[PDB]
């Protein structure tokens, strides 16, 4: 599923401030690498990235292959590969919690700046 900026807004409005992160800086985190895409697949020499939340299953997801991943979030990665994305906001939520938006961001200066841009402003 390809959700829009407000459809998302809504769906993820109660994990404002988690972790210290504003809804404004999730949602610009969300397009960057994932395009709000719930089926987005990021294939790495090592690793790959599932889903709206691009979670790895170098840690965090049980994948083929990844054997000895720590599955942290302690979930087969292909939930996150689905329509629903409540499991995805419980890993997402262990990600903020350990490694903050880094995980994403990498320490660049990607929404930094002009966070209003990312609020819906149509209702
Ligand atoms: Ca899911």
Known sequence: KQF?????????KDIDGYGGIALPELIC??????????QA??????????????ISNKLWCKSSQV???????????????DDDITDDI???KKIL?????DYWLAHKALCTEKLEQWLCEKL
Do not use: W
């Open 67 to 81: 054997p000895q991943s720590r599955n942290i979030c302690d979930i087969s990665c292909d939930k996150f590969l």
């Open 29 to 38: 985190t969300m397009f960057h690498t994932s395009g709000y895409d719930t």
């Open 97 to 101: 919690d350990i490694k903050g938006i």
């Open 4 to 12: 829009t900026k407000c459809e998302l807004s809504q769906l993820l």
């Open 90 to 92: 419980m890993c997402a």
């Open 41 to 54: 697949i990021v294939e790495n020499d090592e690793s790959t990235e599932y889903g709206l939340f691009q």
